[PDB]
Design a protein around this ligand. Structure first.
Ligand code: HEM
Ligand code: HEM
Ligand SMILES: [C-]#N
Ligand SMILES: [C-]#N
Ligand SMILES: [Xe]
Ligand SMILES: [Xe]
Lengths: 190, 190
C-alpha cells in the first residue's frame, strides 16, 4: 500500500505513552472498550468496501469539503482520491486491531502532519490545496460516527451489544482527532 | 450571572455567518435537528441541577483534569469552581435555545479565549494554571455526550424520539468545540 508508512515513521511522536493514558481517560476509554472495538472490527472487515462509498458519497455531495482534494484549478485530483481511499481503509481495521502502543502514536502524529500543511500532499506527489482547516477535522467526528451505526448492526447483532460497538467507535475517534491537532496548535497550548 | 458576557462581547467573531453554514454541514446539522435540540432542552431544564453533579463527579475523579481548576499550589480554586459551574449551566439551555445567529458566534469565540491563555481566568479574578491543553477540549466531546443519554430519557421519552435528542446534542457539541480552537490554532490553519 503506497504511503502507508506505519512503524517506519522514524521521527518520534512528540507526545508520549503516558499522555495517551490521561487522554484515554478523558475520552473515557477503558479496557472494557478494547474488546468491543476488535469486535466492531470483525463486524466491519467484510463490509469495509461499501463503507468507503457511503462516506465518499458524503464528502462528494459538499464542495467546501471536496475542494480539499482538488487540483489547483478546482477539480478532484483522483489519483489522490484513490490513494487516500486506500490508506484510510487500512486505517479502519487499524483502529480495530493495533494495540494503542508507541508506534501507533508515532503514526497518529504522522496523520496530523498529513492533514496539516507540514506534510499535506507530499506523500502522494499531487498538486492541491495547501492546508486542511482544522475546524473540519473536529467536525468529522460526527459523520464518521453516525454513518457507522447502521453498518455495525447489519452482520446481525443484538441492539445492546451493538451499542457497545458504536460507543467504542465513538470514543476511539475523538481520541484520535484529539492527537492530530499538534501541528495545528501554537506550541505549549496542546 | 457573573462573567456571562453574552451579546456584550463587542469584539467581533473572526469567523462569519457563512462559516457556520459550511460547518453545520460538516457536522451534519439540519433544521430537522433544530426541533429536537429545543425539545432536548425542555427535557433537561428541570433536571439541569443533577447534571452538573454527575459531570463534576467525573472531572473530580481525575487529577490531570481537575488540575485545570486549581490555584498555583495545586488545590481547587472553588470560588472559581462555583463561577464556572454557573456560566456552564447557563450554557446547556443556551445550546437548546439560542438560535445560532451572529451574537451566538461572537460568544462561541469568546469561550475559546476563555479556555485559551488569551483569556483564561481573567473573567473570574482567580490565580490558576495558565492554559487548558486543547487536546482535552476535543476529548470532552465524548463524556459531555455519553453522560447525557440517560438524562434525556428519564422525563419519559420513547426509545426513538430520544435517539433524535442525543443525536442532536452530539452534533451540537462537536460543532461548538470546533469553533473554540481559533486562539489555539496557528493563523491560516483554522
Ligand atoms: C474525523 C476526522 C478525519 C478522519 C478520521 C480522517 C481519516 C483520514 C485517513 C485515515 C487518512 C489517511 C491516513 C494514512 O495515510 O493512513 C486521511 C487523509 C486525508 N484526508 Fe482525512 N480524515 C478526517 C478529516 C478530514 C477532513 C475534514 C478532510 C477534508 C475534506 C480530510 C481530507 C483528507 C486529505 C486531503 C488526506 C490526504 C493527506 C495528504 O495530503 O497526504 N480529512 N484522512
Ligand atoms: C467538550 C468540551 C467542553 C465544554 C463544552 C466546556 C464547557 C464550558 C463552559 C460552558 C464554560 C463557561 C463558559 C461561559 O463563560 O459561559 C467553561 C469554562 C471553563 N472550562 Fe470548559 N468545557 C469543555 C472543555 C474543558 C476541559 C477539558 C477543561 C479541563 C478540565 C475545562 C475547564 C474549564 C475552565 C478552567 C473554564 C474557565 C474559563 C476561565 O478561565 O475564565 N473545559 N467550559
Ligand atoms: C478523509 N476523508
Ligand atoms: C468544563 N467543565
Ligand atoms: Xe467511515
Ligand atoms: Xe453535561
Amino acid at each position: 500500500i503506497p504511503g502507508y508508512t506505519y512503524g517506519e515513521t522514524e521521527n518520534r511522536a512528540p507526545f508520549n505513552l503516558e499522555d495517551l493514558k490521561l487522554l484515554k481517560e478523558a475520552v473515557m476509554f477503558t479496557a472494557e472498550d478494547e474488546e468491543y472495538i476488535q469486535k466492531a472490527g470483525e463486524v466491519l472487515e467484510d463490509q469495509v468496501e461499501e463503507i468507503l462509498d457511503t462516506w465518499y458519497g458524503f464528502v462528494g455531495s459538499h464542495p467546501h469539503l471536496l475542494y480539499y482534494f482538488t487540483s489547483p484549478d478546482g477539480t478532484p485530483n483522483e489519483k489522490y482520491l484513490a490513494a487516500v481511499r486506500k490508506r484510510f481503509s487500512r486505517w479502519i481495521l487499524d483502529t480495530s486491531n493495533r494495540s494503542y502502543d508507541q508506534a501507533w502514536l508515532d503514526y497518529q502524529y504522522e496523520i496530523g502532519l498529513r492533514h496539516h500543511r507540514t506534510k499535506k500532499n507530499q506523500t502522494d506527489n499531487v498538486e492541491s490545496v495547501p492546508n486542511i482547516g482544522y475546524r473540519y477535522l473536529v467536525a468529522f467526528i460526527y459523520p464518521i460516527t453516525a454513518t457507522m451505526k447502521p453498518f455495525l448492526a447489519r452482520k446481525g447483532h443484538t441492539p445492546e451489544e451493538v451499542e457497545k460497538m458504536y460507543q467504542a467507535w465513538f470514543k476511539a475517534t475523538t481520541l484520535q482527532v484529539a492527537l492530530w491537532s499538534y501541528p495545528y496548535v501554537k506550541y505549549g497550548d496542546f
